Enzyme design. Structure first.
Site, PDB file in Angstrom:
ATOM      1  N   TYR A  67      47.894 -16.945  29.015  1.00 40.22           N
ATOM      2  CA  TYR A  67      47.658 -18.390  29.072  1.00 40.22           C
ATOM      3  C   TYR A  67      46.221 -18.749  29.471  1.00 40.22           C
ATOM      4  CZ  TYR A  67      48.142 -17.797  34.124  1.00 40.22           C
ATOM      5  OH  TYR A  67      47.979 -17.400  35.427  1.00 40.22           O
ATOM      6  N   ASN A 111      45.114  -7.686  37.514  1.00 40.10           N
ATOM      7  CA  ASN A 111      43.892  -8.190  38.141  1.00 40.10           C
ATOM      8  C   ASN A 111      43.087  -7.022  38.687  1.00 40.10           C
ATOM      9  OD1 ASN A 111      45.078 -10.699  37.717  1.00 40.10           O
ATOM     10  ND2 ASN A 111      44.848 -11.386  39.828  1.00 40.10           N
ATOM     11  N   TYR A 113      39.797  -6.204  40.892  1.00 41.21           N
ATOM     12  CA  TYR A 113      38.851  -6.804  41.822  1.00 41.21           C
ATOM     13  C   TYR A 113      37.725  -5.853  42.206  1.00 41.21           C
ATOM     14  CZ  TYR A 113      42.694 -10.154  42.587  1.00 41.21           C
ATOM     15  OH  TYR A 113      43.703 -11.074  42.422  1.00 41.21           O
ATOM     16  N   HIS A 122      46.018 -21.395  44.847  1.00 39.81           N
ATOM     17  CA  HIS A 122      46.778 -21.794  43.671  1.00 39.81           C
ATOM     18  C   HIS A 122      48.251 -21.575  43.845  1.00 39.81           C
ATOM     19  CE1 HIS A 122      46.637 -17.483  42.922  1.00 39.81           C
ATOM     20  NE2 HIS A 122      47.513 -17.630  41.914  1.00 39.81           N
TER      21      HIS A 122
HETATM   22  O1  PD2 Z   1      45.861  -9.857  43.741  1.00 38.02           O
HETATM   23  C1  PD2 Z   1      46.993 -10.214  44.145  1.00 38.02           C
HETATM   24  O2  PD2 Z   1      47.691  -9.493  44.896  1.00 38.02           O
HETATM   25  C2  PD2 Z   1      47.529 -11.557  43.739  1.00 38.02           C
HETATM   26  C3  PD2 Z   1      48.374 -12.228  44.614  1.00 38.02           C
HETATM   27  C4  PD2 Z   1      48.874 -13.474  44.256  1.00 38.02           C
HETATM   28  N1  PD2 Z   1      48.547 -14.035  43.083  1.00 38.02           N
HETATM   29  C5  PD2 Z   1      47.727 -13.409  42.207  1.00 38.02           C
HETATM   30  C6  PD2 Z   1      47.422 -14.102  40.909  1.00 38.02           C
HETATM   31  O3  PD2 Z   1      46.625 -13.590  40.093  1.00 38.02           O
HETATM   32  O4  PD2 Z   1      48.003 -15.188  40.676  1.00 38.02           O
HETATM   33  C7  PD2 Z   1      47.198 -12.150  42.516  1.00 38.02           C
HETATM   34 MN    MN Z   2      49.358 -15.917  42.153  1.00 40.41          MN
END
Ligand code: PD2
Ligand code: MN
Length: 210
Positions: A67, A111, A113, A122
């Site tokens: 999305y 994700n 990082y 969010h």
């Molecule tokens: O990186 C995370 O653990 C995490 C935690 C909560 N939300 C997200 C997200 O990308 O929405 C990622």
């Molecule tokens: Mn999240």
């Protein structure tokens, strides 16, 4: 005072969190190498346009469904399908441990990082995703913050309502109050070294498409 209100809210957030260590050092190592494979493939230009989202301190890889508070689901087949190793190494373990039922997960987001990375306050879009929301942390330990007024008003409030440790190999499950009534975030200082997370969700039927 605001001390009773902060404690009652934290109580409510906690009732929407379930956490347990499911993956061993070796299982993590295997998955972490597969995540490195995904980063390479992205860099090789092997993925669809909407599969990869690049941002300064954090990268996102959308599989199954992806999305863009008016988020929209890309048309079917616009993002890459969930890689087999995710089904085999991640979703299966969760199904075997009765975390979520089989067939539930149609969306897997990774994700990635850098140190200094963060996510801004969010709520996981309620119009896009069903509950519960499941996530598995990988390269290092960090913390997930709930109640994120502090990211914007550090003067009036310096701390989140709750900080939740998210260690390597742990499974975090969000539902109820924790997923719907409160924002979450990650602070830059809580990501000292590289960190990856795989987020497993079901998308809603009526999730507004494009
Ligand atoms: O990186 C995370 O653990 C995490 C935690 C909560 N939300 C997200 C997200 O990308 O929405 C990622
Ligand atoms: Mn999240």
């Amino acid at each position: 005072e605001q001390q009773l209100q902060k404690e009652e809210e934290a109580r409510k957030v906690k009732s929407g969190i379930r956490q347990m260590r499911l993956f061993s050092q070796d299982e993590c190592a295997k998955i972490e190498a597969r995540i490195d494979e995904v980063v390479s493939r992205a860099e090789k230009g092997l993925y669809n346009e909407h599969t990869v989202d690049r941002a300064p301190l954090r990268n996102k890889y959308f599989f199954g469904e992806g999305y863009t508070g008016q988020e929209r689901l890309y048309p079917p087949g616009d993002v890459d399908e969930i890689p087999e190793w995710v089904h085999q190494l991640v979703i299966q373990k969760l199904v075997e441990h009765r975390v979520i039922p089989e067939g539930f997960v149609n969306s897997a987001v990774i994700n990635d990082y850098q140190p200094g990375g963060c996510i801004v306050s969010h709520v996981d879009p309620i119009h896009i995703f069903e509950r519960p929301i499941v996530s598995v942390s990988f390269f290092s330990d960090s913390a997930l913050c709930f109640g994120c007024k502090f990211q914007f008003k550090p003067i009036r409030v310096s701390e989140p309502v709750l900080s939740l440790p998210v260690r390597r190999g742990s499974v975090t499950v969000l539902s109820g109050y924790a997923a719907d009534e409160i924002t979450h975030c990650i602070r830059p200082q809580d990501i000292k070294e590289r960190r990856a997370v795989i987020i497993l969700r079901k998308t809603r039927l009526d999730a507004p498409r494009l």
